[PDB]
Structures are given as structure tokens and as C-alpha cells.
Design an enzyme around this catalytic site. Sequence first.
Site, short mmCIF file in Angstrom:
data_model
loop_
_atom_site.label_atom_id
_atom_site.label_comp_id
_atom_site.label_asym_id
_atom_site.label_seq_id
_atom_site.Cartn_x
_atom_site.Cartn_y
_atom_site.Cartn_z
N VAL B 25 1.45 12.92 -8.06
CA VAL B 25 0.90 14.26 -7.77
C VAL B 25 1.98 14.83 -6.87
N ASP B 41 -4.72 24.35 -3.83
CA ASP B 41 -3.89 23.14 -4.16
C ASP B 41 -4.22 21.94 -3.32
N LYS B 72 7.63 8.92 5.87
CA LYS B 72 7.71 10.27 6.43
C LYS B 72 6.64 11.18 5.97
N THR B 95 10.22 -0.13 8.64
CA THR B 95 10.21 -0.09 10.15
C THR B 95 8.82 -0.27 10.80
N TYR B 147 9.35 9.50 -5.27
CA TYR B 147 9.35 10.19 -6.58
C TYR B 147 10.54 9.79 -7.42
N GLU B 276 -17.85 -9.16 -30.03
CA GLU B 276 -17.78 -9.56 -31.48
C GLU B 276 -16.55 -10.46 -31.76
N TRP B 298 -24.19 -5.20 -36.22
CA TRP B 298 -24.60 -6.02 -37.40
C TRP B 298 -26.12 -5.90 -37.75
N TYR B 324 -16.93 -14.18 -41.92
CA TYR B 324 -15.96 -14.01 -40.84
C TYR B 324 -15.56 -15.35 -40.20
N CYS B 384 -14.07 -7.21 -44.18
CA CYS B 384 -13.22 -6.09 -44.47
C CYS B 384 -11.86 -6.28 -43.84
N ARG B 404 -9.11 -4.17 -46.03
CA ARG B 404 -9.30 -3.59 -47.36
C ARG B 404 -10.02 -2.23 -47.40
N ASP B 407 -12.68 2.62 -42.32
CA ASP B 407 -13.38 3.85 -41.87
C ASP B 407 -12.62 4.36 -40.69
N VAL B 446 -12.36 8.83 -44.51
CA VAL B 446 -13.12 9.55 -43.48
C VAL B 446 -14.40 9.96 -44.23
N1 LIG Z 1 5.24 19.34 -1.93
C1 LIG Z 1 5.24 18.04 -2.10
O1 LIG Z 1 4.56 17.52 -2.99
C2 LIG Z 1 6.08 17.22 -1.16
C3 LIG Z 1 6.67 16.13 -1.76
C4 LIG Z 1 7.47 15.29 -1.03
C5 LIG Z 1 7.67 15.56 0.31
N2 LIG Z 1 7.10 16.60 0.92
C6 LIG Z 1 7.39 16.73 2.35
O2 LIG Z 1 8.69 16.19 2.62
C7 LIG Z 1 8.68 15.12 3.58
C8 LIG Z 1 8.87 13.71 2.97
O3 LIG Z 1 10.15 13.17 3.31
P1 LIG Z 1 11.08 12.32 2.33
O4 LIG Z 1 10.69 12.85 1.04
O5 LIG Z 1 12.46 12.53 2.96
O6 LIG Z 1 10.48 10.87 2.83
P2 LIG Z 1 9.37 9.87 2.14
O7 LIG Z 1 9.97 9.48 0.80
O8 LIG Z 1 8.02 10.34 2.40
O9 LIG Z 1 9.66 8.70 3.23
C9 LIG Z 1 10.87 7.97 3.21
C10 LIG Z 1 10.54 6.74 4.06
O10 LIG Z 1 9.80 5.87 3.17
C11 LIG Z 1 10.16 4.55 3.37
N3 LIG Z 1 10.74 4.00 2.11
C12 LIG Z 1 11.07 4.67 0.96
N4 LIG Z 1 11.62 3.80 0.05
C13 LIG Z 1 11.65 2.60 0.66
C14 LIG Z 1 12.10 1.25 0.30
N5 LIG Z 1 12.64 1.02 -0.88
N6 LIG Z 1 11.92 0.26 1.20
C15 LIG Z 1 11.37 0.44 2.40
N7 LIG Z 1 10.94 1.62 2.83
C16 LIG Z 1 11.06 2.72 1.99
C17 LIG Z 1 11.28 4.56 4.47
O11 LIG Z 1 10.62 4.45 5.72
P3 LIG Z 1 11.31 3.70 7.01
O12 LIG Z 1 12.22 4.84 7.52
O13 LIG Z 1 10.17 3.54 7.95
O14 LIG Z 1 12.02 2.49 6.57
C18 LIG Z 1 11.84 5.95 4.29
O15 LIG Z 1 12.59 6.40 5.45
C19 LIG Z 1 7.34 15.24 4.26
O16 LIG Z 1 7.57 16.16 5.34
C20 LIG Z 1 6.46 15.79 3.13
O17 LIG Z 1 5.18 16.36 3.48
C21 LIG Z 1 6.31 17.46 0.22
N1 LIG Z 2 -0.60 18.98 -5.31
C1 LIG Z 2 0.07 18.56 -4.23
N2 LIG Z 2 0.66 17.31 -4.21
C2 LIG Z 2 1.35 16.87 -3.13
C3 LIG Z 2 1.44 17.79 -1.93
C4 LIG Z 2 0.78 19.14 -2.00
O1 LIG Z 2 0.85 19.94 -0.98
N3 LIG Z 2 0.10 19.40 -3.14
N4 LIG Z 2 2.15 17.38 -0.83
C5 LIG Z 2 2.60 15.99 -0.64
C6 LIG Z 2 1.46 15.28 0.04
N5 LIG Z 2 1.38 15.80 1.44
C7 LIG Z 2 0.12 15.93 1.98
C8 LIG Z 2 -0.09 16.41 3.31
C9 LIG Z 2 -1.39 16.52 3.80
C10 LIG Z 2 -2.52 16.14 3.02
C11 LIG Z 2 -3.93 16.29 3.52
O2 LIG Z 2 -4.09 16.59 4.71
N6 LIG Z 2 -4.96 16.14 2.63
C12 LIG Z 2 -6.40 16.05 2.94
C13 LIG Z 2 -7.14 17.40 2.68
C14 LIG Z 2 -6.71 18.47 3.68
C15 LIG Z 2 -7.44 19.80 3.49
O3 LIG Z 2 -8.38 19.85 2.68
O4 LIG Z 2 -7.06 20.79 4.18
C16 LIG Z 2 -7.08 15.14 1.99
O5 LIG Z 2 -8.17 14.62 2.38
O6 LIG Z 2 -6.51 15.01 0.84
C17 LIG Z 2 -2.31 15.67 1.70
C18 LIG Z 2 -1.01 15.58 1.19
C19 LIG Z 2 2.91 15.29 -1.98
N7 LIG Z 2 1.92 15.62 -3.03
O1 LIG Z 3 -14.35 -4.01 -39.73
C1 LIG Z 3 -14.78 -3.12 -40.45
C2 LIG Z 3 -15.91 -3.23 -41.31
C3 LIG Z 3 -16.28 -2.18 -42.05
N1 LIG Z 3 -15.59 -0.99 -42.05
C4 LIG Z 3 -16.02 0.14 -42.89
C5 LIG Z 3 -15.18 0.39 -44.11
C6 LIG Z 3 -16.18 1.05 -45.03
O2 LIG Z 3 -16.40 2.40 -44.63
C7 LIG Z 3 -17.44 0.24 -44.74
C8 LIG Z 3 -17.55 -1.01 -45.58
O3 LIG Z 3 -17.99 -0.64 -46.88
P1 LIG Z 3 -17.39 -1.35 -48.15
O4 LIG Z 3 -15.98 -1.07 -47.97
O5 LIG Z 3 -17.76 -2.77 -47.95
O6 LIG Z 3 -18.09 -0.79 -49.30
O7 LIG Z 3 -17.34 -0.11 -43.36
C9 LIG Z 3 -14.47 -0.82 -41.26
O8 LIG Z 3 -13.83 0.21 -41.24
N2 LIG Z 3 -14.14 -1.91 -40.50
#
Ligand SMILES: NC(=O)c1ccc[n+]([C@@H]2O[C@H](COP(=O)([O-])OP(=O)(O)OC[C@H]3O[C@@H](n4cnc5c(N)ncnc54)[C@H](OP(=O)(O)O)[C@@H]3O)[C@@H](O)[C@H]2O)c1
Ligand SMILES: Nc1nc2c(c(=O)[nH]1)N[C@@H](CNc1ccc(C(=O)N[C@@H](CCC(=O)O)C(=O)O)cc1)CN2
Ligand SMILES: O=c1ccn([C@H]2C[C@H](O)[C@@H](COP(=O)(O)O)O2)c(=O)[nH]1
Lengths: 494, 495
Positions: B25, B41, B72, B95, B147, B276, B298, B324, B384, B404, B407, B446
Site C-alpha cells: 500500500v 486516503d 523510519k 539498530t 518498496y 473427497e 455424491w 474411483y 469422469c 472425459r 462441466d 457449459v
Molecule cells: N506516501 C507513502 O506511501 C510513503 C512511502 C514511503 C515513505 N514515506 C515517508 O518517507 C519516510 C520513509 O523513509 P525511507 O523511505 O527513507 O525509510 P524506510 O524504508 O521507512 O526505513 C529505512 C530503515 O529501515 C530499516 N531497513 C530497511 N531495509 C533494511 C535491511 N535490509 N536490514 C535492516 N534494516 C533495514 C533500516 O533501519 P535502521 O536504520 O534502524 O537500520 C533503514 O534505515 C517516512 O518519513 C515516510 O512516512 C511515505
Molecule cells: N495509501 C497510503 N499508503 C501509505 C501512506 C499513505 O499516506 N497512504 N503512507 C505510508 C505509511 N505512513 C503512515 C503514517 C501514519 C499512519 C497512521 O497514523 N495511520 C492510522 C490512522 C490515522 C488517521 O486515521 O488519521 C491507522 O490506524 O492506520 C499510517 C501510515 C506508506 N503507505
Molecule cells: O469430476 C467430475 C464429475 C462430473 N463432472 C460433470 C461432467 C458432466 O457434466 C457430468 C457427468 O455426466 P456424464 O458425463 O457422465 O454424462 O458431471 C465433472 O465435470 N467433473
Amino acid sequence: SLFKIRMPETVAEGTRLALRAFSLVVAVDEHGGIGNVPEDMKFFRDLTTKLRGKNVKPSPAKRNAVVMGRKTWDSIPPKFRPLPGRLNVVLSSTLTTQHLLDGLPNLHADSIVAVNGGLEQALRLLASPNYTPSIETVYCIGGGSVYAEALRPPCVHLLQAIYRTTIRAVFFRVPESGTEAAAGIEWQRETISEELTSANGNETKYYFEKLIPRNREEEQYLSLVDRIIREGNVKHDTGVGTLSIFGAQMRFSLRNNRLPLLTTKRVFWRGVCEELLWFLRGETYAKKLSDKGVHIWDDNGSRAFLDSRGLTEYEEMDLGPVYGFQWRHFGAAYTHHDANYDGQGVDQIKAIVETLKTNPDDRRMLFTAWNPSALPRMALPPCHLLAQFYVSNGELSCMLYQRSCDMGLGVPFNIASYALLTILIAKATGLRPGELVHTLGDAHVYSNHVEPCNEQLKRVPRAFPYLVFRREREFLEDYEEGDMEVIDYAPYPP
Amino acid sequence: SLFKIRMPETVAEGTRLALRAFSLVVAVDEHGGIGWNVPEDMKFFRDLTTKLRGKNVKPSPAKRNAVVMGRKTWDSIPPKFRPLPGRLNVVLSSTLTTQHLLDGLPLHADSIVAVNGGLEQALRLLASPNYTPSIETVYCIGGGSVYAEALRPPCVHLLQAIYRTTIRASVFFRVPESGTEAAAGIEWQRETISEELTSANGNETKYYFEKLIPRNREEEQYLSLVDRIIREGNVKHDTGVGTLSIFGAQMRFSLRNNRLPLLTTKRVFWRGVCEELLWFLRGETYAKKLSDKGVHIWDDNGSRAFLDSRGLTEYEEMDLGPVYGFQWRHFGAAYTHHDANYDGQGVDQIKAIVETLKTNPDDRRMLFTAWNPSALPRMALPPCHLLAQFYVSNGELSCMLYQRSCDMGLGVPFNIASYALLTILIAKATGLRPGELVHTLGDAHVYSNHVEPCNEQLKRVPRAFPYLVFRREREFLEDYEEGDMEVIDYAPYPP
Ligand SMILES: NC(=O)c1ccc[n+]([C@@H]2O[C@H](COP(=O)([O-])OP(=O)(O)OC[C@H]3O[C@@H](n4cnc5c(N)ncnc54)[C@H](OP(=O)(O)O)[C@@H]3O)[C@@H](O)[C@H]2O)c1
Ligand SMILES: Nc1nc2c(c(=O)[nH]1)N[C@@H](CNc1ccc(C(=O)N[C@@H](CCC(=O)O)C(=O)O)cc1)CN2
Ligand SMILES: O=c1ccn([C@H]2C[C@H](O)[C@@H](COP(=O)(O)O)O2)c(=O)[nH]1
Ligand SMILES: NC(=O)c1ccc[n+]([C@@H]2O[C@H](COP(=O)([O-])OP(=O)(O)OC[C@H]3O[C@@H](n4cnc5c(N)ncnc54)[C@H](OP(=O)(O)O)[C@@H]3O)[C@@H](O)[C@H]2O)c1
Ligand SMILES: Nc1nc2c(c(=O)[nH]1)N[C@@H](CNc1ccc(C(=O)N[C@@H](CCC(=O)O)C(=O)O)cc1)CN2
Ligand SMILES: O=c1ccn([C@H]2C[C@H](O)[C@@H](COP(=O)(O)O)O2)c(=O)[nH]1
């Protein structure tokens, strides 16, 4: 007898060949216009006269036919009228066969026929038993009105190949791909020569092309072989290497006598057909096949092979209750080949034939050879192991499931085998042949067949051939390989 | 018990969930920047990340969502809202320990956890038994570095949905474009996009919402076939019931890395699939064992009237005969009545294939069937889905089913799930990982009356499939139960 499947009165009907297939030969100018190059006349004579077989002298038993309009006939120099060594079929509303004979200056009576009609009427005559299969290739040699009719439906769907010479000196236009005039055909070049120079004293520039209708069905097979080599998994078992993939599906039309015998490598049709009949008869003794010169079971029917399965008590070439045995007698107790199993086991083929005739919408019209109770008593578990039928619009379709598919030699053989089964069951049930669907499990190329498969993948597939029946039988089990014949099969060389 | 199939001690291995799936998402400006005061959204964000999908019940440690955020972003949440209430808050930091986060608050110890690692590390945590299945949906809420990790492999293959708000108002949020290397084969598409909205914030700020999902070509195969049957199938009427049909088709579904091909455009009755399937694998034939678990599929075929119509007048009600699973574990055995002792009778095809898979996985005869023409007339209804074949490659088990009669409305999605589950179970029985399911269809249809709701279903764009996890294991294959496994992240469309 009571256990055989009686053919219905309609047996010949849905397989009768409507129109015989044909090829076209034409010379045009640089603008495609159709209004003295001896190399082109040499090509014309050789291409229209020679049979595909080694050293065959054309005769009424086996020869080509040329079909032409009456004005093309008039314009042949009388030295070569009728064209020698070919049947000459001449389209005319005005001139009978006798009138054409009277225009010569008795030797030629069996070699000239007039048809009061167009190319379609001529193709309908050439499909009759006096001319099919005796005529090997029909060539249409124009002129313009005949070419027009050849290049539109219904004739165009029977056009196998177009041989066009272009000579630097009414238009001949092959429909373009995707256009309404093309009727779903995609014309492509198999070959095009370099620019050539005539020895006619005028240094005439000319070139040849051969166009063919793109065959997407065989392309499916090709594509799958290419994918198996490029991407299949290598496995080694004895240590034989394969490349494989798992799960695939292809489809082939059987409509209007088409037979999907692959063209990019010749298929052993005589072997396909003998074996399929042997399955349908419920046979299990492979010697029945090797005595007809069909050796496909010799390795798996040897004393050695049978012993390696534990089948020590079987006589050589008795395969146990394989295949057709389960098709006609599923679950019957097997003792030895050629005992009397009438009435034993389930006759799945008879039952499907009866259901097709009375309730063709049934969804249970399937048969199987995969019987795990009998598996250990078989020389080999079946690889083509079930099939299911479906009916729509009076056409019968079949889907085959095959567990293990050798793409090089098995798969083309099994496509043909199931095409023929479907055609025979449609003849037994009052139906026309529709589509074959082939499902593949483990589909593989042996690793030593990779370079030849790559060489085969160089070839552009040609139009498939057709299947006709010379005669019929009172029972399905009495069909023979000589009752039917494959026409217009033009595979590439080995 | 000598006749059952003992699970190997590798049983849990090939099915352990590596990373938990999640959704993202984010809010951006019109340039894609992430740097707002749009209360609608925040309301959206708050509702989406807090609410559960079934009953709108109070989230608790037994059932809630999680939010995953970098350090992040945690720092930037206003103390009224820190940690977010009603969600598990997972904070990524090299981290800050969980206790350091607790220390920075002015009741919350079970609702905050620090992870020393990135999003992948958080998803591995969230996959453990303490958090799956109790966390229903995991939401990644940024910031930029998190992503960026969500949007590349391996995490992006677990990303089910991206909810982006754009607001007319540094670092850019960019979703990889189709067919690019950065997309890793995924094709992101919009399921929804709002009209341009005006905020009630004092500034009439303009904004809009999108939800993006990874195109699911597997489910599209099914929908394309449904569409083709309706537009081009042949109409048939049987007792007068109408269908549209085609003949011969084939689909394929990946079971890899816990994926379960339960269709999303119409909910599948998984609990009935599972009950079955296990019933088949045990070799059962009494349908009352199912209807007593509330699985009624059946009941019509096991009635007195229905059995009598097949000639099966001596079979007690709900005794289906040797259908069968009875053929799977006892092919060819003589049948008397349900629940007799069939041990060692007939061919146990499932056991045999399990032993072959363990010792010669390249074998090309690992197929089982229920299509037994000798036994067909004793059965309440011929099978069948009648056969299946296994294949192994690269340590992965694949399975192809042949069906054979198909359906497409109700049967087909049910049986995709059935054979996906079978394959997963047999892989767990043989030391293999689940591979691919291949589904071959014969008569695919069909029913006439389902045309209009199939056409309503074809409006929907399929969403990512869910996943199958095993809560616990068993000593024998036959002892598995529907409560031993759980489908997670299944988000089908409404009825
Ligand atoms: N509109 C949207 O849908 C949307 C989408 C993306 C982002 N955003 C915004 O953009 C920002 C996200 O930042 P970003 O996209 O730069 O960061 P991110 O992908 O959210 O975070 C990157 C952090 O994830 C951890 N990470 C990722 N791959 C890893 C791996 N292979 N192994 C271990 N750790 C891993 C690392 O944390 P550590 O540093 O702790 O090791 C890395 O520094 C947020 O502010 C967000 O709300 C918005
Ligand atoms: N499509 C959609 N997808 C996304 C984001 C977006 O922007 N919209 N942004 C990124 C996710 N970032 C956030 C930041 C805050 C919250 C958040 O706080 N959500 C509360 C609801 C908050 C509210 O209702 O105001 C929840 O319970 O889901 C969710 C995703 C990546 N995916
Ligand atoms: O595993 C099965 C058993 C039956 N049928 C369907 C095929 C036919 O529509 C009908 C069987 O009728 P006859 O072909 O036996 O006349 O049931 C299937 O598609 N799959
Ligand atoms: N470059 C080339 O390859 C090429 C190609 C074609 C032609 N040509 C040249 O053009 C000339 C041929 O002329 P063309 O193209 O005008 O004629 P053509 O097509 O060879 O002959 C037409 C005649 O064929 C008969 N015919 C055609 N359709 C018919 C039907 N449906 N039913 C009954 N009869 C039918 C009719 O004969 P009746 O009048 O007797 O009924 C018609 O008059 C030759 O001199 C040749 O040199 C060259
Ligand atoms: N490609 C090619 N195709 C063509 C023509 C061509 O021009 N070349 N022209 C048209 C056919 N017209 C003729 C004219 C004369 C002959 C003829 O008389 N041929 C003798 C050989 C004569 C010779 O050797 O000169 C033969 O035995 O085939 C054949 C077709 C239509 N198709
Ligand atoms: O009709 C058949 C029978 C067999 N095979 C091939 C498949 C395998 O490569 C081989 C048999 O070996 P197994 O599948 O039985 O192990 O023959 C075919 O292509 N077609």
C-alpha cells in the site's frame, strides 16, 4: 458371425471421394500475365509425365493426367497432340471426345477424354474408380478461365502445389494470405530458383517457383520436436539418452478424405494399416505381422525379450493380452495367442459402435488398453492407451491419449493409426470422419536423433494426402490393407 | 499397517513455506514520488490494513493482519497511532530491538516485533507457524528501500496486489513494466482505478486510487475456454437438458513454491475438494462418509432411486460400488459391499507409483486409472477424471489428468484443485517438490442455463492464486485430514 461388427448400408457413403486433388502448372510474364524457352518446356514435360516411382513406364494402369481448356488443347503443336505419356482431359461445351479424335491426323483413344464441364466436373470424373488411384498426379495446365476456377473454392482446397515459371518478355494471381479470396489458405514458396538464362539465342531471363498451401497441422508436430530439442530435459535410462517434455496436444482434420500422413519424413503406411487391423481383430501373435513384412514387433516378441519380462511360458512372438486383446476382450483371462476368446471380456469396440448409432451424444464412448490386472502378462504396457469419441454435425472425432511418445518414429505412425481407426469407426456407424486430437504425455526425441531431426526441421511441410476405399466388407474385422489406398502422398526424400 | 503408504521423514521439506505472500500500500504524487493531508486516503489505508476479509470481526492474536515497515516509517507514525492499533506491527531495523521499540512508547508487547533484516527476512518470519495462518494478510507499507525490495525478486513473486493512491501535490515508486528484465516475467495490470476525487481537506486536493495485480495467465486459460464454448460450442440436449460443448483441450498450472491453483473469479469449495480427495486416496466407496462431513456432492448418485435405476438394487443407500479410489487402490478386485476388507485385493496403483517415484523417477509407466470396463456396470457412475500420469524433472513432480466430461462451471475448477492437492501429496510421499499440473479435457461443456452467469464471471480479471501449507504431518498418506492443511491468501471475487 455374431461376434463381428456388421457394416451398415451407408458404409461407402461418407468416405466416397468427391473431387480428386490436383496440382497447377503455369508460365507467366513479369507482370503475372499468362497472353520460346526450351528449358521451361523440358521442365513442363518432365514434371507432368514422370511418376514418382523408380523407372515406371506410364500406362493406363499408372500415369499422370493433364487437364486443360479446349483453347489450350487447340494451341498444342500437333507434333505433341495429345501430350504423350499422359491422360489428356479436355474441358469443352462444344467438342466430344470423338471430335477431339477427329482433329488428329486409334493409337490415342485411351489417352483422350472430353469433359462437358469445368475443372470441378473434371475433378469429379477423375475421383471415380476408373481414374483413382490409377492416375498418380492430376496437373491442371490452364488456360485462364481454368486457372480462375482452380484458385477459388471448391477446387482450391484440392490444390496441392502450384508450379509457376516467370519469363522476362488476363493475370495469374495467387490469393494473398488472410484475404477473403484465399478461403483460409496461406500460400507459401517451397522453392524459388536463381534467375536463369535461356539457351534460346535471345538470352531470355526466367525463374521457377513451387508454392504449396501452408500445413499448420504438421507445423504443430515440427514445433514440438524443435521445442523438445531446444528445451527438453536430458535423461539417460541401459544408458539410452532422450530429451523430453511433458504434456502436449495436437489436432488433425480427417474431413473430405484427408489423411494426416506426415510429409517431412515418409510414414510406413502399409505397416500402420496392417497393425491397426490386427488391433481391431483382437490379435496378439506378432508373427501375423512379421509374415506380412511388418517387423515393428520383432524386438518385443523375441524369446529373449519375453524371458526378460518373466514370460517364459509364452511361445516366441505371443505378446500376451496386449492392445486389441483388451479392446475386444477387456479383462478376459488370457491363455495363449489364437485361442477362442469369442464372448469373453468386454468388447469395447462393439459397444461404442452401437452407442454411436443410437446415442451419439453419450460422454462415455471411450475404450482402453491400460488394464493394470493384465499389465504384467503383456510383453509391453500399451503406449497409445485410450481413446474417446465425440460426435458433432454428423462428424466423428477421436481423442487419443499416449503416455510415451517417440517423436521421431512412433508419433507419426500413431497419428496415422488413429486417423485410420476413426475413419473405419465412422464407416461402421453412419458418420463422416471429423477431427483427431492427440494428447501426449512424456514426449521425447532419442538423443542420437537430434541431428537428423534438425535436418528434418529444415523442410517446409506439404499438403497431406487422402484415403479412399476401393471396396468394402460386410464386417469391420474383414477389412484388409488392399481395400484402401493413400493417393497424392508426396513426402520429401529420406 | 502393511497396506498403507508410509511418509518419508523428508515429508515436511518440500512443502515448507519459504516466504509468506503479501500486498503493498503506497501513496505517491503525480510524478511517482513517495517524499499529505488527504483524510479519505488515511481512512482507506486504515480500513484496508485493519479489516479481515470474512466476518468483520475484532482482530486479535488468533486472527489479524500484519503491517511491515522500515524503521523510519515507524519513526514517522504519530504517537496517537503507534504502533498501529488492530494489526501486528513488524519493524525492519539493524539498530532497534523489539524492546527498544517498546521503550519509545509513552498493552502492546504482542503487537510489535523488530526484524534485523529486510523485507525478505520479515516474510520468512511471517511464514513460520506462529504467524501463518493466523495473520490473514501481510501489508508492506514502505518506505523507499522496503518498496524497492518488494518490487524485485525474490519478494516480488510473493506480491499479490499493489494498492496505490496518487495525489496531486526525491525517490520514485515504479512498478516494473511488462516484458522488461526488471519485471521478472510478471505483467502488472490494473484491476481497478477510481475516477478523479476531491478531498474534503480544506484544499480540494485531487487524488485517485488504483489496485494492480499480477496477470494470472493460468486462470485466463480457463476463462478463454469458457468464452470459446459459449461463443462457438455445439448445442446439444440430452431428458431435455441443454449444453454447449467443444471437444479436446488442455490447460497447465504451476504448483511450485506452495502455489495452489484455486480459481479466483468464482470461489471453489476447497473443503469439499479436500475431503473427497482424501476419500479417494483411502480407497473409499461409501458416500455417507462424505455427506456426514457436510460434503453432499455424491447424495444424488447414492440414493436408493438412483442406485435402482443402474440396476444396483442390492447395494445399500450411498454404497457407490467399486468407483474411483477403489480402483486406484484395488484395481480389478471383486466388490461385495462398502467397507469390507479389501487389503491386498486388486492392484494398488497408488502404492506402486509411490515406490517407482522413489527409485526410478524416469519411468514412463507411472499412470493410474479408474476406467475399468469390467467394473463399470457395478459403479453408480463411471469415473469422469479417469486417469493420471506422473513425470519428474529437476526434483519436481508433475501430473497430467485426463477428464472425459468436463462441466466448466462447477466440475472443472473442483478437479483442478483435486489433482493439484493429489500431486502435492504424492510429492510429500516421495521426496519430491510439487511441479506442474496438466489437465486434458475431452467433452468440455457449459450447461445452457449457466451461460448468463458465466458471462458475468468473464467480466472479472483473475487475481493471483493462493498457497497451501501443512499445519502438521502424518505417518501414513491415508491418515491425512482436511484440518492438517490450510489455504492462505485466497481472495476470490464475490458470488
Ligand atoms: N506516501 C507513502 O506511501 C510513503 C512511502 C514511503 C515513505 N514515506 C515517508 O518517507 C519516510 C520513509 O523513509 P525511507 O523511505 O527513507 O525509510 P524506510 O524504508 O521507512 O526505513 C529505512 C530503515 O529501515 C530499516 N531497513 C530497511 N531495509 C533494511 C535491511 N535490509 N536490514 C535492516 N534494516 C533495514 C533500516 O533501519 P535502521 O536504520 O534502524 O537500520 C533503514 O534505515 C517516512 O518519513 C515516510 O512516512 C511515505
Ligand atoms: N495509501 C497510503 N499508503 C501509505 C501512506 C499513505 O499516506 N497512504 N503512507 C505510508 C505509511 N505512513 C503512515 C503514517 C501514519 C499512519 C497512521 O497514523 N495511520 C492510522 C490512522 C490515522 C488517521 O486515521 O488519521 C491507522 O490506524 O492506520 C499510517 C501510515 C506508506 N503507505
Ligand atoms: O469430476 C467430475 C464429475 C462430473 N463432472 C460433470 C461432467 C458432466 O457434466 C457430468 C457427468 O455426466 P456424464 O458425463 O457422465 O454424462 O458431471 C465433472 O465435470 N467433473
Ligand atoms: N502462360 C501460360 O501458362 C498460359 C496459360 C493459359 C493460356 N495460355 C495461352 O492462352 C490460350 C488459351 O486461352 P484461354 O486461356 O482463353 O482458354 P482455355 O481456358 O485454355 O480454354 C477455354 C475453353 O475451355 C472450355 N471451358 C472452360 N471452362 C468450361 C466450362 N465450365 N464448361 C465447358 N467448357 C469450358 C471452353 O471450351 P468450349 O468453347 O469448347 O466450350 C472454353 O472456351 C492458349 O493459346 C495459350 O497459349 C498460356
Ligand atoms: N511451365 C509452363 N506451364 C504452362 C505453359 C508453359 O509454356 N510452361 N503453357 C501452357 C501449356 N501449353 C502448352 C503448349 C505446348 C505444349 C507441348 O507441346 N509440350 C510437349 C513438349 C514439346 C517440346 O518439347 O517443345 C510435351 O511433351 O509436354 C505443352 C503445353 C500452360 N502451362
Ligand atoms: O505406439 C508407440 C509405442 C511406443 N512408442 C515409444 C515410446 C517410448 O520411447 C518407447 C517405449 O518405451 P517405454 O515408454 O515403454 O518405456 O517407444 C511410441 O512412440 N509409440
